[PDB]
Amino acid sequence: CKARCQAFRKEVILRTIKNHKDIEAAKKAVYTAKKNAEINGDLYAEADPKLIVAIRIRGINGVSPKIKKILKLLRLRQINNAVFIKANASTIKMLRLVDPYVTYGYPTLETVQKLIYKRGALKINGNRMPITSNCMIKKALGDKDVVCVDDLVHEIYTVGKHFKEVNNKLAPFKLNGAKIAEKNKKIHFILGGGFGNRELLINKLLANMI
Amino acid sequence: PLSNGRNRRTRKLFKRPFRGHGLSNTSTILHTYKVGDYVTILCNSSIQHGLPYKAFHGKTGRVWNVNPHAIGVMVNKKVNNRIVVKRLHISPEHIKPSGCQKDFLERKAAVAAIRKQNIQLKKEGKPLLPLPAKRLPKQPRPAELIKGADIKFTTVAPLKFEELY
Amino acid sequence: SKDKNRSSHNQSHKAHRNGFYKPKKSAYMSTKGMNVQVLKNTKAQRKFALAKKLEAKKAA
Amino acid sequence: AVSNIHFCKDWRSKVHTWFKQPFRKIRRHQTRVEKAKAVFPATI
Amino acid sequence: IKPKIVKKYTGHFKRFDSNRFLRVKASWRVPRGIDNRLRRKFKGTNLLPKIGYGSAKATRNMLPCGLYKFPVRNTTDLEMIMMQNRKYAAEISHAVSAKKRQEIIQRAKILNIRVLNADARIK
Amino acid sequence: ATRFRQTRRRRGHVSMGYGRIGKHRKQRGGRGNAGGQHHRKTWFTTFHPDYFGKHGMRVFHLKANKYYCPSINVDSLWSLVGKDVQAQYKNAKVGEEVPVIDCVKHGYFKVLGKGFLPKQPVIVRARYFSEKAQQKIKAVGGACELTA
Amino acid sequence: AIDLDRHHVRKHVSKTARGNNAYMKLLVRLYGFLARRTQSKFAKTILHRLCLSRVNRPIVSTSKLACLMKKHPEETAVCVNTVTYDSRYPVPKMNVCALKFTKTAEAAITKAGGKCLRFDELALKAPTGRKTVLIRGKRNVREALKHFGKVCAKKNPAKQYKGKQTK
RNA sequence: AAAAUGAAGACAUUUUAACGAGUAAGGAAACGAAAUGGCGUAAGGACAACAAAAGUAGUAAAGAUUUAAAGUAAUUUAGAU
RNA sequence: AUAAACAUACUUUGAAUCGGCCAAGUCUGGUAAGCAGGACUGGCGAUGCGGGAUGAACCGAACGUCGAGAUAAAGUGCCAAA
């Protein structure tokens, strides 16, 4: 009857063990290679980031026709809507044409977790259903070998082979409000503004926005 | 305010290329266009008979029908809010073989070369080859070491102003 | 009482409400005006295949 | 469809309502009934 | 048992410009004028009846007593709600005389039905 | 049903469904088919191109009773007499009785050839016959009479 | 606010038997419960076609059923529409199931040995649909379709509603 | 919108999700899971104490002045004079 | 690469409208205009709300009825919440 629930939990525990290995083992090799390069006098070139988290900053009134379409393809159709974007030569260029309406950086694992645990949602049968179990995630994403929520958080973080399928399934998060800028949101973050690339300083803004 | 002439505003659109006057080549009248080829229309002002409309200059079309002295070419023309199908008949002097599928037709050959090996490896039992990797935009570069034996440094600072007069 | 002679203001955002109506794939397959020699070979074979097809149908 | 309607002339004075039709049927039927009575080969 | 009847607006939606003129009655008619101060929803005067004001479905058309209204004209109408005396309350119509009212009022006591007009047309 | 019209739902609207910028003035381009060649030319061109002109000769007193000639195709000849009578004579041949489908009685003069007749001999009696109608009747094994 | 491509309006697909035909309101109830429970695409197809207007339920003459069921001996043709009679060509033996059989089409089918089922008897006999040949008659034969468009056009003209000074 | 249930319950059913500004203009009536929902005036055909006296009315009709209740609203109901 | 099943393709019938005006890291005639005439885009028209004391267009931001919170433009001597 319900003896398969007991066995299912063990598989989720097994997957959480293995999922945390890839994240921790890849973190150790980055730090180990940083120590060996300092001792030998060599230089180290840190790898480029693979994930970009973009937040819509402005409203919907007064958007140029082409920029309006790029935001729709990024699923930033509302103010204070954060999504996870793959970084390559295309989306980086797309995220640059619409800069006055987005602020984006790179998320740490402590930020991917909070967004998905607190503001997570899935599109099942066309309804944006908030995440409340793993049997809901397994039913929607069973064929993508994503049966739990630490399989969903891991795939987003490391940008796996099934990232696009996972990414579109997650609905764009609806976030709170928080102080975006020092001067205002009409100038680049370089000049102490609101939009533009914030790199690892986006985690500070997402902490007050979740 | 302009006029309604057929070839209006053609001081620089129909002007021949610099030091390109006179006769065209001999491969212009010798290339073989078969039905289904992608060719580019390029109006040639040296040959007036049959000059295509100036709005089709540079558009890319599909050869649909090859007539003894003219090559049928169909292109998409834009109207108020709909796209229509235009069916011209351009002499070979006014069109050029488009190489839009230059990249694509070399990917097909690479895949066909691999698939030819997979029908031999499978027959003889060897493990078949994997298909070529797909094209992706410029991916984020990984982390790579830099030796400290062939390195050199140049300090970078804002430059002191030097007057230009 | 003069007036504004012409203005393209808003005439391009209007055309993108109902987007550019592309032509259907049946519009690219018309065989009107094709080579008269090619259209006589295609007709001369379609008649030949049809005659042998209908005869086989009648036989059974 | 191009209209062909002949109402440009006066028509409200050229109407003929058929309200007497229910009573015409009775009036004629009460003539044949009162004609066969006189001599039957009259209505024959 | 009675659920709290919650009202989202306890006032009346009076017609615009009915506090100045007498030919304009106090029954609501939405203004269609181009320069109207109210149909544009100017600040200070932006009161129009919008479907969001509608009260809760569970407690809609419910009297403060907690019972819906059911009008009766004779003693035989009372039998239509003799099974639902906890949901419906009789209310004798305003045309029923002062003799037929004592038949309905007394019968409503036998079937134990609350009557909202128990002191109407008394001697 | 004047409670179903648009006037009963358009009460309270000042313009009454006819616009403020352009009101509902009396005439909107003449009375009837006025302006057929001046300002409604884009109508009698788009929707009635051959409206304006002359074509064909004039028949001063046309006699429409001499152009009257109803036609029945061969496939519908057997339905004049019925489907019971058709089956009854389905095995007849030359020498034995076969029904005469007198078309003129039913109001069909001409007999045209369209579709297929059942494989039974049949007699057809009608005023006018089509060239391919006679072949269809005769190929089945029948006869083609004439009347009047 | 949110920027959407277009706002949510009514979907232009019907889901009930129109009008007040208290017998068509039952088949939709009957076939709207067989499609939901069995989840068979035949019942969804039958339910969907029962909720179409009159102009979208064209008639199927008995000579169309004859030439469509020539190579289907033991099958039950299922056409959700009226079934008229083709008085020019014979009617072989076949089992049919339609919304309405014309008097001469009903007498002709049962005379040759066939059957004329209604749509209730078909659901009882083959609810999921096992030996049925779904049929629907032609839709472009309507005369109103000719006049659509502009007659002046160069590719496909219309047919010029007749009127004054026609020629 | 999608699922569930569905001969009569009732509030135009139950669950989930997204959405809701707007002049000109459109959304006729009926359509059980309803192809928008309703209020009001007058007239006509029916229904209105179902055990053979069957809607209300000289134990005070329609109307008028107010007071309270229901409905977001058009408006309805009731008390008193 | 990214987005797309209340997606996509439409068909029939029909209403309103074709007096427009403003902004500009733009242009033409003009000495110049809150002048006249244009190209790309956003708005006012059709539009309220918070801010510029007031303002059709500027900045924020577009609205079912509400309660609690972090916000945007912009401010924190008093009128005036800080």
Next chain:
RNA sequence: CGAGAAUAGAAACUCUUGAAGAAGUAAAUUAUCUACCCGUCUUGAAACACGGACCAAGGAGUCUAACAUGGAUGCGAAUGAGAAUAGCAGGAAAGCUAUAACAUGAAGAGAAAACGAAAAACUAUGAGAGUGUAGAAAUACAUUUAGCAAUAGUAUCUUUCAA
């Protein structure tokens, strides 16, 4: 130390006010905040633009004739025959019956004489229906069969100088 798992465990409370009027609602006044004249032409009116002193009653997309699209209905190669007109019971501006001229349609083109349709069709995609395997629940996969509607192109046929 200890997740899973096996076995045992624990939640029914207190005070104040109200038929001497609790909670809620309504009316009048005060107090902080908020509030330019309605209808209309207009790019733009609160406008130094026009009508409006107040109240009551009346007051403006209606009727017939012709065509067309669509929603509901009957019948369907027929439909209508409440075309005149003729009968029936009942006394009737209502109801019923009239194998019936004719209207639209079943055949199309041609100015007109003169004519008047199958190769018992072809091709492509296409709606369904079974079977087995599996995730093992819905559902996905593999295979046999079917070709409706629709779109495009085809052969063949009637009429036209021309399709």
